[PDB]
Structure 1
Amino acid sequence: SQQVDKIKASYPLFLDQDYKDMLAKKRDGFEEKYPQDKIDEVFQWTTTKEYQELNFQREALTVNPAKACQPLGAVLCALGFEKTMPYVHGSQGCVAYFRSYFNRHFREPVSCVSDSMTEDAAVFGGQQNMKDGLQNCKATYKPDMIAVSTTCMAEVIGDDLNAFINNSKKEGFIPDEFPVPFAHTPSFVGSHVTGWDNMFEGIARYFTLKSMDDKVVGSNKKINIVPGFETYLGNFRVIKRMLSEMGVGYSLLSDPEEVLDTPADGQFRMYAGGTTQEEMKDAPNALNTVLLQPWHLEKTKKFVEGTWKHEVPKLNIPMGLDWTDEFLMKVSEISGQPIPASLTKERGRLVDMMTDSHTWLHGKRFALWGDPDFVMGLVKFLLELGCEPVHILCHNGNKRWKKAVDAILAASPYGKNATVYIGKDLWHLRSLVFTDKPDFMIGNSYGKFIQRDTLHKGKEFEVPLIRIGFPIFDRHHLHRSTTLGYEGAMQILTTLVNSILERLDEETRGMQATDYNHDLVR
């Protein structure tokens, strides 16, 4: 039943007695459900260290991964170029999924096409799909560039992207000079960050490999910036911002911040901003290239150094105090621009926030996850804040990255009780926050299910999620945030101290029970 002046949606409608009764009856008559006492017994068993040892013994089963597949990455790389259509050669289901995944995180249109390879194409290859696909995309959507990646169907059957694009050009489906960069992106190798790297290096090769003869390193007097797979608009925004404050000539190569934030003004813009083809062609002429997220830009580093001859600075992701300082100082060294008064003040203001908020942050324990570069930057900033990064999980990390983070941890008293996990997933993490309970989790929205499980054991065992990462689907507009630079460090500091203080307020809100410590001033 509904009362017309207060319509109830699914919650709380199904708590109404007649529905509760109807669901109790469904269960009892037909579901043959395990008795609740057994369900509770098994729940308690899944929280124990005994369960944890068997969980960590898994080698074949993955449960709740904290990574996605290669072509996802390639599409986001491609969207950063001016009037470019991401095109994934393979089967169409994949594209519908990549588009929905990003639609949900950015709450924006995400334009990408497929060339719809079906069963018959497995037996005969996808050449005709490439030929008509490219032709149809060019005429219908009017891209200035089509950037091609692949699905695992196309990867397993071994389609030669190069030959297929070259044959499309030879047979006149697309004009000979129309830009069609490609990258093979097998989903069974690495993860989404590997697909971004592969696509970027493929686009870089396309515009510069055969033109190197006339390029002099330093002649355009700019520094190239390669962002990596980045899903916060504030991160693209802040890098550009600080370099402009310093008067540093730069070229951001792959810039999606305009296509992922168009105005709702009465018309849909399929394409907006982005790195131009002219900037990619002129990129060898830069003084040097800085990789903002180096641990998933390995292929790119080898091409920038080997073909463009830039000596790519050994810089960590510009996250936290020390690594933003290093970033700005290296940019100053390369461009010969002084770090301006504005940035020195912004730095001092972050340090001032750390002195104000240090007593509440000191010794707070965190479990966290995400991509390699984001995670190490978060660990670094947490150590600078005097926090303990007790469980560091990176599903798509590798052995050398783990060696780097363990070195970072070894360098701080606050890294002493921390362990880095690579290859582990969120069901592995669930056990760790039960057996060695942290104070908070810093992660993406899949973390909500771990908070739900810890609350079921009891409120004193609940570990709150602090949403920083990708994907964040259950909150609106956090993709506009910043995690890089002093700006991003300021935002993270504020979110951490305030998450701690909201949890303290909740714990001290009980009248005559715990509210003696419900302070007006903290």
Structure 2
Amino acid sequence: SQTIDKINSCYPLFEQDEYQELFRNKRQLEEAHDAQRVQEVFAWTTTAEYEALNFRREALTVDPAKACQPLGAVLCSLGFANTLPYVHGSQGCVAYFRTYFNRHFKEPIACVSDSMTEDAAVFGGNNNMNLGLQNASALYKPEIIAVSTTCMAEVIGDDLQAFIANAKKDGFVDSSIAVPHAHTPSFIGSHVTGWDNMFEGFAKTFTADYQGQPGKLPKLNLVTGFETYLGNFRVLKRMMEQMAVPCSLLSDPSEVLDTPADGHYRMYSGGTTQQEMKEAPDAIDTLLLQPWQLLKSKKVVQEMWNQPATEVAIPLGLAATDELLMTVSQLSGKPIADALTLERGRLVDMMLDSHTWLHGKKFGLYGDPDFVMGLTRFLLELGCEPTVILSHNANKRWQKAMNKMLDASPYGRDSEVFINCDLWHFRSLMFTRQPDFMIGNSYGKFIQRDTLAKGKAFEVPLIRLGFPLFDRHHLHRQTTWGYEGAMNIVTTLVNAVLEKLDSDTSQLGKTDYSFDLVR
């Protein structure tokens, strides 16, 4: 039933007595396992014995913490001006890529498919590529159609390069349109590998025949890699303007992922221009800001553009932002701006003001390899203990570097690093290692729920930092790099500590001797 004055949605409508009776009656038709047995199995999934069997898995993956290559090629493509992402293969992939980013950014996402079906599985998709380029050009009028692939296209052996050459030769795509491409097999690597592969395709299309000269333009290019915080693209440009060092980001989707609601839909907005990409070889250098995934991009910068590819750490935290600015200053010969030194000192003031709530706290964390290395480094620098560190898509070379960093820190003595493991593995580790908090994406909500069901004392609350963020709004506007981003991270971590302590001390007459007004 419903009353006119207070209509209830699904929750809490289904809490009403008539629905509780409905569920009891429906349960008698399911041959449910008894509550006692379901309780016994739940408890057993929280144990060290279950954990050991869980870590024996060699074939089953459960609750992955990674996506597939073409997702990352689509996001890289969205960062160039007047560019339409196009994925050669089957159309279900593009419906899912669009939806995935729609739900994180709360924005429209343009991307087409060429709809290979059973016919193309047998003949190859050259007809789909010709008609696809033709129809997309007509409807959407892109200046650039950036092509990646789905696993069907990869398995059948479609020769991308040849197909696009044929479309050009036969008049399906005009000479005015650039068609960079990359092979992006979802059975290799993850979405971060797709981004890097797509970037190399843009570098070849726009610069391979160019005779460049490093430092002809007194600028620095910056490459972010796969990044889903709009504030990170923006802060980099803002800091470079304060340094007075000309800069281009190469792949910047921050304007097309934040168009105004003013009565007009704008499929294209901002992005790296063709001029920026074409003149990239003349910069002083290109700084690859997520170095573990930007592998082919580093070969572009050194082997194609003959630039230094100065090594930089992900600019997450105080010390990694100091190191980025000293690198920019050294390469450009320009001093670090006094407004940047002032910002740095305000971050240090915040770190000193909030240190007594953060020191010694224990965190689990997961995400992409570059993000997890940067956040683990900043947690050590805060005097926190990153006890459980997981990256499903990281490799053995990364793991060796992480263990080297942790061994060298007093705050890494109890840390364990896991690669090629998933969120069902992370779930056991929250039960057995029980850190104070876990930093993750929206998939971590179910692990917080699971730990709470063992008991209030076993709950590990989630702090949302990563991708995808689907169950809170407008977190994708935030910043996590630079001093600005480190201010967000410090604030987020200390207020997570303080919200949890207030909740724990909020029981009137019982634990509210320590529900302190001032903290």
1:72-128 deviation per Cα after TM superposition (whole angstroms, max 9, x unaligned): 000000000001000000000000000000000000000000000001101110001
1:253 matches 2:250: yes
Give 2:23's aligned amino acid: L
What secondary structure, in the 3-state scheme, does the structure 1 residue paired with 2:439 have? strand
TM-score (norm 1): 0.99
- Structure 2 distance, partners of 1:14, 1:178, is 55
Q: 2:340 aligns to what?
A: 343
How many correspondences in the alignment? Answer: 519
Indicate the SS of the match to 1:472: coil
Q: Select the residue among 401, 422, 426 that pairs with 2:423.
A: 426
Among all aligned residue pairs of Structure 1 and Structure 2, give the percentage whose two residues are the same amino acid.
68
Task: Tell me the equivalent position of 1:142.
Answer: 141
CA contact (8 A) 1:70 1:191 kept: yes
Partner of 1:119: 118
Separation in 2, partners of 1:423, 1:469: 18
Aligned to 1:41: 40
Work out which of the residue numbers 476, 496, 513 in structure 1 matches 2:510: 513
Distance 1:411 1:266 in 2: 55
Matches within 5 A, 1:490-509: 490-509=487-506
Is residue 2:76 matched to residue 1:58? Answer: no
Deviations 1:267-289 (A, max 9, x none): 11110000011111100000000
SS at match of 1:296: coil
401-410 vs 459-468, which deviates more?
Answer: 401-410
Corresponding residue for 1:131? 130
Q: Deviations over 1:359-413 (max 9, x none)?
A: 0001000000000111111001111111000000000000111111111111211
Residues in 1 aligned to 2:25 and 2:136: alpha-carbon distance in whole angstroms: 54
The within-5 A match list for 1:104-503 is: 104-212=103-211, 215-503=212-500
Cα distance between partner residues in 2 of 1:407 and 1:488 = 25
**Which amino acid in structure 2 is aligned with residue 15 of structure 1?**
E
Q: Which whole-Å CA distance do the structure 2 matches of 1:210 and 1:419 have between them?
A: 47
Shift of 1:341: 0.5
In structure 2, how many angstroms separate the alpha carbons of the residues matched to 1:177 and 1:232? 33
Once residues 399 and 343 of structure 1 are traced to their aligned partners in structure 2, the CA distance between those partners, rounded to angstroms, is: 36
Which amino acid in 2 is paired with 1:66? A
Deviation of 1:209 (Å): 0.8
Q: What's 1:77 paired with?
A: 76
Structure 2 CA distance for aligned equivalents of residues 436 and 10 of structure 1: 36
**Mapped partners of 1:170, 1:308: distance in 2:** 29
> Aligned letter for 2:418?
Y
Structure 2 residue identity aligned to 1:495:
T
User: What residue number does 2:13 align with?
Assistant: 13
State the Cα distance separating 1:177 from its structure 2 match.
4.5
Distance 1:384 1:7 in 2: 50
Q: Which amino acid aligns with 1:8?
A: N
Using the TM superposition, give the Cα deviation of residue 217 of structure 1 relative to its aligned residue in structure 2, in angstroms.
Answer: 1.1
- Taking the aligned partners of 2:54 and 2:282, their CA distance within structure 1 comes to 52
> For each residue in 1:138-187, what CA deviation from the matched residue of structure 2 results, as whole angstroms up to 9, or x when unmatched?
11101010000000000000101100000000000112352000000000
Residues 68, 194 of structure 2: 8 Å contact kept: yes
Distance in 1 between the 2:125 and 2:275 partners? 31
Q: Match for 2:89: what amino acid? A: G
Structure 1 unaligned residues grouped into runs of 5+: none
Q: CA deviation at 1:221?
A: 1.1
Cα deviations by residue, 1:176-227 (Å, 9 ceiling, x for unpaired): 3520000000000000000000000110111111223xx2111011111001
Q: Structure 2: how far apart are the matches of 1:366 and 1:414?
A: 11
Equivalent position amino acid for 2:96 in 1: Y
Contact 1:369 1:443 in 2 (8 A): yes
Report the AA paired with residue 135 of structure 1: Q
- Rounded to whole Å, the distance in 1 between the matches of 2:406 and 2:349 is 24
1:444 maps to amino acid: N
TM-score normalised over the length of structure 2: 0.99
Task: Note the C-alpha offset of 1:18.
Answer: 0.9
1: distance between equivalents of 2:418 and 2:31? 39
**What's the secondary structure of 2:178's corresponding residue?**
coil
Give the match's secondary structure for 1:71.
Answer: helix
Counterpart residue identity of residue 260, structure 1: L
RMSD across aligned positions (CA): 0.6
| Counterpart residue identity of residue 140, structure 2 | Y
Distance 1:395 1:67 in 2: 6
- Structure 2: distance between partners of 1:477 and 1:406: 34
Tell me, in whole angstroms, the C-alpha distance in 2 between the residues paired with 1:132 and 1:274.
27
1:100 matched to which residue of 2?
99
CA contact (8 A) 1:232 1:479 kept: yes
Indicate if the aligned counterparts of 1:225 and 1:251 stay in contact, CA closer than 8 A. Answer: yes
Q: Helix, strand or coil for the counterpart of 1:359?
A: helix
CA deviation map 1:335-358 (0-9, x unaligned): 111101000111111111110000
Matched letter for residue 10 of structure 1: C
Is the contact made by 2:366 and 2:439 (CA closer than 8 Å) also made in structure 1?
Answer: yes
- 2:261 maps to amino acid: A
Corresponding letter in the other structure for 1:78: S
Q: Name the CA distance, whole Å, in 2 between partners of 1:45 and 1:364.
A: 27
Q: 2: CA distance between counterparts of 1:178 and 1:211? A: 18
Structure 1: distance between partners of 2:298 and 2:206: 16
Distance in 1, Cα, partners of 2:56 & 2:483? 41
**Aligned residues of 2:142 and 2:177 also touching (Cα < 8 A):** no
- Maintained 8 Å contact 1:170/1:176: no
What does the per-residue CA deviation read over 1:239-273, in whole Å, with 9 as the maximum and x for residues that have no partner?
A: 11101100011110001000000000011111000
Amino acid at match of 2:113: S
Structure 2 unaligned segments of length 5 or more: list them.
none
- Look up the equivalent residue of 1:402 and give its one-letter code: Q
**What secondary structure is seen at the aligned counterpart in 1 of 2:270?**
coil
